[PDB]
């Protein structure tokens, strides 16, 4: 019951697939982009997020801050970062939720089997960039 | 009409419309079925077998396509309906058939700046926006002006002209009226290739000589 | 009455342990505030029909 | 119209009949000897009924 590769271009069907998909698809729609200096080691652009990653905010009142993710809520599209808070009417602090597509990944987390997820996708991309080169260079003759 | 409603008749000091049967709910005793009752049906319901299309005389269809082709060479008509042209050499515009070798979009955009069609593709870009009333939520959200039309004579399509915002394509063997005179007003800006431009005397013929590739058709004669 | 069949007794028991309000630990949550059970029955107004 | 009383009283009696006991005596070609063991009243009859006992049969 995955829905993010729908053929339809109907507005009601697309908003329905964003707000009501399963939790597996909520994580891929919560994807972030890598920095320039981290995108020279791995070849790819965006990768999804988890706790422990270091990011940087871009736009809003926390524009320019940097911190570590302390909690994620995939179902509601909410990320909590250490250092972006507010004081309630009691003296206490609370963390503010941010939307995942306004962050940039720098120095992610590599401990619970995540070092291999990055290496599997780095191989699939360079294998796919050669099917395109062989086709292109031969279609160069085409 | 999904009730067993019946009128109560006269003698009870209420009007004669039919009314819901039952008890124990606020629906019980209210009006039903009539076009002036809440939750009723329409007086004359809309039906699926009304006529949606119309028939055009076949010869008048071809007279209209020939007027639209004729008006694409008057510079006063092509500038009346937009189409900013101050730097084209002459109308009509004809290029060779070797633009089909531009299969990357980066090259097709270079061919179009060489023909001085540059400030035309900028006018279409800046006209795009959201539609005003209720149609925006019926899958019709953006609108924009019409741009250039490329009439070629090759097969399915030119892949390198397909992404440009403000460019259409049409085959010489189709030649439809809905692309030639958009909105019903003639005078679009058309670019011909040299193979397509030479087939124009067989499709339309003359005023006193019949056309081959279209049996019977002759241009209409003049009344003044 | 005191006399009743076995099938009448087990449906009266099921109806009995249904007539209850939302528990307090669920109402105290952040995203369940302002919620009451609203499917409640009082033995004088509405009858069960055996 | 509706159905007359005569016809309904006939239908009530096939549903809930009046029953009498069917008196009769058996076949015995040789001269035997009986024995009146009782004389009794019966519902729906006016005549009393006798119970007579033979060597291998009652009537």
């Amino acid at each position: 019951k995955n829905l993010r590769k729908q053929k339809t271009s109907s507005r009601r069907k697309q908003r329905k697939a964003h707000f009501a998909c399963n939790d597996g698809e909520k994580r891929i729609r919560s994807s972030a982009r890598l920095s320039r200096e981290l995108r020279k080691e791995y070849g790819f652009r965006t990768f999804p997020l988890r706790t422990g990653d270091t990011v940087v905010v871009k736009g809003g009142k926390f524009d320019g801050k940097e911190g570590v993710i302390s909690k994620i809520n995939y179902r509601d599209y909410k990320v909590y970062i250490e250092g972006c808070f507010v004081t309630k009417n009691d003296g206490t602090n609370a963390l503010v939720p941010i939307y995942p597509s306004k962050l940039t990944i720098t120095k992610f987390f590599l401990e619970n089997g995540r070092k291999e997820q990055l290496e599997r996708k780095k191989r699939a991309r360079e294998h796919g960039m050669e099917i395109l080169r062989k086709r292109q260079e031969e279609v160069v003759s085409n | 009409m999904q009730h067993s409603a019946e009128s109560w008749g006269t003698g009870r000091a209420i009007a004669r419309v039919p009314r819901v049967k039952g008890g124990g709910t606020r629906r019980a005793g209210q009006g039903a079925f009539a076009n002036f009752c809440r939750k009723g049906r329409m007086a004359h319901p809309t039906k699926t077998h009304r006529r949606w299309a119309r028939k055009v005389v076949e010869n008048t269809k071809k007279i209209a396509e020939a007027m639209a082709v004729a008006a694409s060479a008057q510079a006063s008509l092509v500038e009346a309906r937009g189409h900013r042209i101050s730097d084209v050499k002459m109308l009509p515009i004809i290029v060779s058939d070797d633009i089909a070798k531009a299969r990357k979009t980066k090259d097709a955009v270079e061919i179009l700046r060489n023909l001085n069609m540059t400030e035309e593709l900028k006018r279409v870009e800046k006209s795009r926006g959201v539609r005003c009333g209720k149609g925006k939520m019926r899958n019709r959200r953006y609108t924009q002006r019409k741009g250039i039309l490329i009439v070629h004579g090759e097969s399915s399509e030119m892949l390198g002209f397909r992404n440009i915002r403000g460019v259409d394509q049409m085959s010489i063997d189709s030649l439809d009226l809905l692309e030639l005179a958009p909105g019903g007003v003639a005078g679009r800006l058309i670019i011909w290739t040299e193979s397509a431009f030479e087939k124009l005397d067989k499709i339309f013929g003359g005023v006193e000589r019949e056309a081959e590739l279209t049996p019977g058709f002759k241009l209409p004669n003049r009344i003044v | 009455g005191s006399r009743k069949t076995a099938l009448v007794k087990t449906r009266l028991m099921r109806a009995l342990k249904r007539n209850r309000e939302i528990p307090a630990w669920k109402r105290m949550m952040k995203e369940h505030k302002g919620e009451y059970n609203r499917a409640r029955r009082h033995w004088r107004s509405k009858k069960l029909k055996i | 119209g509706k159905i007359t009383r005569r016809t309904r009283e006939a239908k009530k009696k096939q549903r809930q009949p009046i029953v009498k006991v069917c008196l009769s005596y058996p076949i015995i070609p040789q001269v035997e000897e009986g024995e009146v063991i009782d004389i009794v009243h019966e519902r729906s009859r006016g005549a009393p009924v006798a119970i007579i006992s033979f060597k291998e049969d009652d009537c």
Binding site: - | - | - | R8, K11, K12, Q14, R15
Partner: protein
């Protein structure tokens, strides 16, 4: 259905593998006696003469 009594089907009792055999031979006798009490044509009666 208008003050009447019911339809009362029958579905009479069934024979059990020895009443049936007892019922087949009753029919074979009743039918054989009718075949010898009416006049028998010549082409069927000639088979009553064997070696």
């Amino acid at each position: 259905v208008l003050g009447k009594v019911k339809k009362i089907p029958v579905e009479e009792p069934r024979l059990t593998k020895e009443q049936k055999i007892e019922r087949d031979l009753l029919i074979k006798k009743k039918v054989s006696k009718l075949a010898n009490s009416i006049r028998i044509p010549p082409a069927i009666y000639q088979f009553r003469t064997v070696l």
